[PDB]
Curated annotation (Swiss-Prot), chain A:
Interacts with UBR1. Present with 4750 molecules/cell in log phase SD medium. Belongs to the proteasome subunit S1 family. This is 26S proteasome regulatory subunit RPN2. It comes from the Eukaryota. Acts as a regulatory subunit of the 26S proteasome which is involved in the ATP-dependent degradation of ubiquitinated proteins. The gene is RPN2. Disulfide bonds: none annotated. N-acetylated by NAT1. The chain holds residues 288 to 358 of 945 of the full protein.
Curated annotation (Swiss-Prot), chain B:
Belongs to the peptidase M67A family. N-acetylated by NAT1. It comes from Saccharomyces cerevisiae (strain ATCC 204508 / S288c). Acts as a regulatory subunit of the 26S proteasome which is involved in the ATP-dependent degradation of ubiquitinated proteins. Present with 19800 molecules/cell in log phase SD medium. This is 26S proteasome regulatory subunit RPN8.
Curated annotation (Swiss-Prot), chain D:
It is an enzyme of class 3 (hydrolase). This is Ubiquitin carboxyl-terminal hydrolase RPN11. Transmembrane segments: none annotated. The lineage of its organism: Eukaryota, Fungi, Dikarya, Ascomycota, Saccharomycotina. Signal peptide: none annotated. The JAMM motif is required for the deubiquitination and degradation of ubiquitinated substrates. A motif (JAMM motif) lies at residues 92-105. Present with 16400 molecules/cell in log phase SD medium. SMART domains: JAB_MPN. One of its GO terms (molecular function) is metallopeptidase activity. GO terms for cellular component: cytosol; mitochondrion; nucleus; proteasome complex; proteasome regulatory particle, lid subcomplex; proteasome storage granule.
Length: 71, 50, 212, 289
């Protein structure tokens, strides 16, 4: 069970969920300053926020940036 | 061959002057170096305080 | 953190190299840049109590100064731009005003003397109430890099512990959960030996089964 | 979605690049033009293989100056020799003006843009090729509807790319309200390279070949005579070099251009030249007899 590696991953998932510290302000700061209908600015911000919430299955990014993604 | 000799030697003049110049630059930079050590004493303690 | 090689076995990780070489192809193509998640590895020491294969909360000691670690940050301020504007205004107004103010000081001061400043009998003896030195030096902490500290504080299991502060972790000899051999001294999953199975601790289960 | 385009970079082959130049220099001041024969592959490579020149008009470059009748006739001639493929656009040559499409050139281009959507307009400047770099740029119309939706960002993503400029002014105005410029790379194979490199029959006939010794006596005499003069300025100069601030000394006692550097350069050039002059001299005497 241990050698399959799926337990070790599970232990790590519990860690990433609880102890996560993220900037809820970055999402709004990124949103206003960099536009989503300017494609280049969207690309940077989408890759930037994803790295930020890495490791933990979150819907925080969708709800913050609900209109912004569709542009 | 004689023109080449004077020229090689002309280039040697120019370089022995460039040798002395950088050597003066070092003599100058010596003062700065001394002063810096006494000064760095004050800075170390402050950065640790903060 | 991104780790380049194990500090235990001294030998590269496959995931990490593959991460960084693919990541440089982001400058050739904006959509291929999502290999930097391979480079990341979470760092934490995670104790496993072998009884139930689930995560115990127990306290391990850290020899380390108390305040040298925090989570960064949040930045905001733009109402200072307003504040600066009305500050410069009052100050220029006083110079314009001066001619009047000088007479004003004549009348004001005798009134304060006979009575009080406001509701205190102080801070009118002098310019303040003191005229002595105020300079003080060598105040606050004397650390700016971890160094070494003989001060202990206790930390919970499965918390963020950087690899630069993982080496100072020590397991308490008055605590039952201590590893089978000794610590490896580096982040990674370490198995804990439970002395007594006849005394429980509150646990933290695996969460990939708590999402089912 | 609709259909979504991204960057392209126009690859102008060695044969085509010279051909455009040849045609553009010759017909100037009059605006010269011609069709681009090529093939379009990938979503990032417009391959312009060859060009040819269309007869010029005194009515410049316009919708009615292209001539499609002469095109159909030209196409068959390329057909029999295997040198036909499919037409990928047009080029024209402005003279002293930048790379940019005039109002008349928009309407010319719009007709090409319907027929093939991947039509480029390539502006050649031949009065500005007098530099060591040939200024050439390419444009491609972006649709009127597209600009309202602000789809110029759409074309920029997916690489950092060069995002090279060589001209602005009129170019950037026209960019906002019409087109998207394309960066230029040039293709060439490892055969084409050698031809390009070779520009001499003086590859083996240039080291034993030499200039009379009269001319070497002139170089020797000029060189020695001048270095005295640089040496007399350096002597006035270095009566100083012991005051305050380098920058001051250079103005007042004429340290400008560095006479120390200027003498080194003049000595180095003739010194290296005479080793060659002897070196070739003796080589001939000993090998030939």
């Amino acid at each position: 069970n241990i050698l399959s590696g799926l337990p070790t991953c599970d232990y790590y998932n519990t860690f990433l969920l609880n102890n996560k510290n993220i900037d809820i302000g970055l999402l709004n700061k990124s949103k206003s300053s960099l536009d989503g209908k300017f494609s280049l600015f969207h690309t940077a911000v989408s890759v930037a926020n994803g790295f930020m919430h890495a490791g933990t299955t979150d819907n925080s990014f969708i709800k913050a940036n609900l209109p912004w993604l569709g542009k | 061959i004689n023109i080449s000799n004077n020229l090689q030697k002309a280039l040697t003049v120019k370089t022995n002057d460039e040798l002395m110049v950088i050597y003066i630059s070092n003599l100058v930079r010596s003062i700065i170096a001394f002063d810096d050590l006494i000064e760095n004493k004050i800075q170390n303690k402050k950065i640790q305080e903060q | 953190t991104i780790q380049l090689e194990n500090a235990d076995t001294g030998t590269l990780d496959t995931k990490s190299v593959v991460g960084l070489v693919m990541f440089s192809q982001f400058w050739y193509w904006f959509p291929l840049a999502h290999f930097l998640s391979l480079s990341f590895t979470p760092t934490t020491v995670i104790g496993i109590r072998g009884s139930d294969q689930a995560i115990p909360k127990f306290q391990m000691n850290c020899y380390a100064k108390e305040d040298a670690f925090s989570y960064p940050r949040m930045y905001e301020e733009a109402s200072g731009k307003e504040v600066e504007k009305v500050a410069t205004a009052v100050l220029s107004t006083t110079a314009r005003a001066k001619a009047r103010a000088k007479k004003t000081k004549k009348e004001k001061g005798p009134n304060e003397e006979e009575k009080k400043k406001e509701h205190e009998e102080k801070e009118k003896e002098r310019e303040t109430n003191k005229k002595g030195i105020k300079e003080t030096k060598e105040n606050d902490e004397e650390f700016y890099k971890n160094k070494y500290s003989s001060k202990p504080y206790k930390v919970d299991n499965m918390t963020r512990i950087l690899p630069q502060q993982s080496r100072y972790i020590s397991f308490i000899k008055d605590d039952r959960f201590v590893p089978v051999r000794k610590f490896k001294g580096n982040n990674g999953v370490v198995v804990l030996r439970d002395r007594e199975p006849k005394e429980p601790v509150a646990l933290i289960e695996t969460v990939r089964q708590m999402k089912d | 979605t609709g259909r979504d385009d991204t960057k392209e970079t126009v690859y102008i082959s060695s044969i085509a690049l010279l051909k455009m130049l040849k045609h553009g220099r010759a017909g100037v001041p009059m605006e010269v033009m011609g069709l681009m024969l090529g093939e379009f592959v990938d979503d990032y490579t417009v391959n312009v293989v060859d060009v040819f020149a269309m007869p010029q008009s005194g009515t410049g470059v316009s919708v009615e100056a292209v001539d499609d009748v002469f095109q159909a006739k030209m196409m068959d001639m390329l057909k029999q020799t295997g040198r036909d493929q499919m037409v990928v656009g047009w080029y024209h040559s402005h003279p002293g003006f930048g790379c940019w499409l005039s109002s008349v050139d928009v309407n010319t281009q719009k007709s090409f843009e319907q027929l093939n959507s991947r039509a480029v307009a390539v502006v050649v400047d031949p009065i500005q090729s007098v530099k060591g770099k040939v200024v050439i740029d390419a444009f491609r119309l972006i649709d009127t509807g597209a600009l309202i939706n602000n789809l110029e960002p759409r074309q920029t993503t997916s690489n950092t790319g060069l995002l090279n400029k060589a001209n602005i002014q009129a170019l950037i105005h026209g960019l906002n309200r019409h087109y998207y410029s394309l960066n230029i790379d040039y293709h060439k194979t490892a055969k084409e390279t050698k031809m390009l490199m070779n520009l001499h029959k003086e590859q083996w006939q240039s080291g034993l070949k030499m200039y009379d010794y009269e001319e070497k006596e002139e170089s020797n005499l000029a060189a020695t005579k001048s270095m005295v003069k640089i040496a007399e300025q350096y002597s006035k100069r270095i009566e100083e070099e012991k005051e305050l601030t380098e920058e001051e000394l250079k103005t007042r006692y004429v340290g400008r251009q560095d006479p120390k550097k200027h003498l080194s350069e003049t000595a180095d050039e003739t010194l290296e030249n005479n080793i060659v002059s002897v070196l070739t001299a003796g080589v001939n005497s000993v090998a030939i007899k």
